[PDB]
């Protein structure tokens, strides 16, 4: 008989409320059975009882490490259904904060992966940088993480009068912190022993199982949604896409580090190219007017009242909108029946498919290797369970 | 436009082989990692002396809710119920009637602070700047009931925090 | 920053880099916590003339999906969903890490 073991939910390596039922012969893993749903909150039904603006803060709490990226995907879906266009300055702000968010997510992923493996130190070095980016979030929206800044019309508020300078000051020091992380990990023989040839997935298998993002790029597949299906102003920035060679945990780690560097590159470009103008679509039947207009003009007051009580109506139709979120392809299948409430909202999270493939990726490995594989899949269970 | 992260081949000359043998036998990269940690030991820690020292915040910061007044001392809230309609958590409960002088005022104004997500949508929706999220964040209670705010509690919060709330609004209202 | 120069030398030697050049604590180069007021430019629809809403109504230009091949109702060269993707180029900046 194989030993049957509960891995989580109350486990440090679990990375959330995961009940990994594991069959083991000695420490060899014979079978992985991920039991999820310990963080299923019934988000999609709730979204059905809300208006389109009331449903936005749910996308903050889907993947709690990539908040604005989740907001951007939902906003793109709703804007596509509304047949409107965000203004250019809003799109530049969106891309800038999406890259800052990608930095946040990649720091969290790499350091928690190292912490599982046993290298506890880089976490503390990188979480101070995460703290400074949380400060950027807070200055723009008043919240450290669940900002709700990106709205289906653009962004809620314009940047405060000295934010770009501080973002520049942060961005010109971050590369040295990445360098210190790489000094700790990249050439360590212990880290390579714990990561090289662990959780190897082929290109064909990665495509069929539904993988996306780094889980594809580590296996040599050349696919990045920002390059192939660009959104906002991603076609106007220059960056390279890291590609792996072996499909293992080590290659995925290198891809994420290089991705962090390329995000610094994109941020530098966005800082030097931010244009002037308004921040939300100049269409008061979709985006609320300014407060001075709301307090002086009859139409502005009527539209403020109606947008905050009933909300805008969205013409009937269904869309599937996908973005390159820091964890992979993040999608929304949004169905509108013509009213101000969404009829259906299905959320596609890359972690769902990655966790469904965890059992495949752990064949012939031990317990510690399974811990490394869970770390390398970059799983947050808010997006998996919803 | 792409780059490779692990497609480099190692040199096979005798010098390179001897350098790699020295790396294997004398553990050079491990000493590199030790040097990095030793370097961090001599830096100044990023720790702050809480509660004496506080983390930086912004005028846009979302905290505990408060109900404000006009400079005359009259309440700003007119019971339009836009905050109650917009609240994604349904955390606001409002009941209203004509006041003794015929004014349109609330008789019940509750916020369930354990339902609230602290999104700030209500202060955006308020047309008279009556409901705000003030700057306070240190209001942990010992019981659940203390976090079920009625109109008296919110008016008291407004009275207690008006000096800072008005200064925060003055610094941010031109972005709104 | 503020520390002894011998400790700075030891830090630089152990880390291998000049630490002082890129300090991770923000000493005084960050923006002031009080700023002048902004002015914020208005949008393109803030015109006083020639601004009828029916000419800038994006919601009302959405239409039901176009129907191809209802079942209820030449060589003919084969076709694909879209032209094949061009192969990627290898990063003239830094092709190999």
């Amino acid at each position: 008989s194989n030993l049957t073991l509960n891995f989580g939910p109350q486990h440090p390596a679990a990375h959330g409320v995961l009940r990994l039922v594991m069959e083991l012969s000695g420490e060899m893993v014979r079978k992985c059975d991920p039991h999820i749903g310990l963080l299923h909150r019934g988000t999609e039904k709730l979204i059905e009882y809300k208006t389109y603006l009331q449903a936005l803060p749910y996308f903050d709490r889907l993947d709690y490490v990539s908040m604005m990226c989740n907001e951007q995907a939902y906003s793109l879906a709703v804007e596509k259904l509304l047949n409107i266009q965000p203004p250019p300055r809003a799109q530049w702000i969106r891309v800038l904060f999406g890259e800052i968010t990608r930095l946040l997510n990649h720091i969290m992923a790499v350091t928690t992966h190292a912490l599982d493996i046993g290298a506890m130190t880089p976490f503390f070095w990188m979480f101070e940088e995460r703290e400074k980016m949380f400060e950027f979030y807070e200055r723009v929206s008043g919240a450290r993480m669940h900002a709700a800044y990106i709205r289906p019309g653009g962004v809620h508020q314009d940047l405060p009068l000295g934010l770009l300078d501080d973002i520049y000051e942060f961005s010109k020091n971050f590369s040295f912190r990445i360098d210190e992380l790489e000094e700790m990990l990249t050439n360590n023989r212990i880290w390579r022993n714990r990561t090289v040839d662990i959780g190897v997935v082929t290109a064909e298998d990665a495509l069929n199982y539904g993988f996306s993002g780094v889980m594809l790029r580590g296996s040599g597949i050349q696919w990045d949604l920002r390059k192939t299906q660009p959104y906002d102003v991603y076609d106007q920035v220059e960056f390279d896409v890291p590609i792996g060679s072996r499909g293992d945990c080590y290659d995925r780690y290198l891809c994420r580090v290089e991705e962090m560097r390329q995000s610094l590159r994109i941020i530098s470009q966005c800082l030097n190219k931010m244009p002037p103008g308004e921040i939300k679509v100049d269409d008061a039947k979709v985006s609320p007017p300014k407060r001075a207009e709301m307090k002086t003009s009859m139409e502005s007051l009527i539209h403020h009242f109606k947008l905050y009580t009933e909300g805008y109506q969205v013409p009937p139709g269904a869309t599937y909108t996908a973005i390159e979120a820091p964890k992979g392809e993040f999608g929304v299948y949004l169905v509108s029946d013509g009213s101000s409430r969404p009829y259906r909202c299905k959320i596609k999270a890359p972690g769902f498919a990655h966790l469904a493939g965890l059992d495949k990726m752990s064949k012939g490995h031990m317990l510690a290797d399974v811990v490394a594989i869970i770390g390398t899949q970059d799983i947050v269970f808010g997006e998996v369970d919803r | 436009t792409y780059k490779f992260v692990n497609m480099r081949e190692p040199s096979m000359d005798m010098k390179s082989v001897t350098d790699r043998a020295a790396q294997t036998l004398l553990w050079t990269e491990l000493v590199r990692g030790l040097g990095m940690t030793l370097s961090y030991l001599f830096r100044e820690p990023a720790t702050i002396n809480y509660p004496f020292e506080k983390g930086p915040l912004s005028p846009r910061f979302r905290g505990e809710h408060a109900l404000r007044r006009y400079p005359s001392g009259e309440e700003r809230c007119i019971a339009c119920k836009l905050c109650e309609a917009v609240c994604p958590a349904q955390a606001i409960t409002i009941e209203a009637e004509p006041r003794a002088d015929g004014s349109r005022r609330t008789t019940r104004y509750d916020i369930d602070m354990t339902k609230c997500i602290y999104c700030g949508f209500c202060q955006e929706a308020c047309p008279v700047d009556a409901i705000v999220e003030g700057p306070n964040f240190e209001f942990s209670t010992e019981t659940h009931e203390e976090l079920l705010y009625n109109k008296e509690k919110l008016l008291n919060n407004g009275d207690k925090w008006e000096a800072e709330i008005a200064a925060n609004i003055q610094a941010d209202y031109l972005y709104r | 920053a503020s520390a002894t120069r011998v400790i700075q030398l030891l830090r630089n030697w152990a880390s291998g880099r000049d630490l002082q050049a890129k300090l991770q604590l923000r000493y005084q180069e960050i923006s002031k916590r009080t700023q002048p007021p902004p002015k914020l430019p208005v949008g393109p629809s803030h015109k006083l003339s020639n601004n009828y809403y029916c000419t800038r109504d994006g919601r009302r230009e959405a239409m039901p999906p176009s129907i191809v091949m209802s079942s209820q109702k030449t060589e003919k060269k084969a076709v694909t969903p879209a032209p094949p993707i061009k192969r990627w180029e290898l990063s003239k900046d830094q092709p190999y890490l």
């Binding site: 000094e183 610094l264 931010m274 | - | 430019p41």
Partner: peptide
């Protein structure tokens, strides 16, 4: 008649930001 004031990059541009990996050799033979 006040002019538009808005958070923008300074005239010309911001100073260049390093992003490439910097791992020195740092050893004997």
């Amino acid at each position: 008649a006040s002019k538009v004031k808005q958070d923008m990059p300074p005239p010309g541009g911001y100073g260049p930001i390093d992003y490439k990996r910097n791992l020195p050799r740092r050893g004997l033979s």
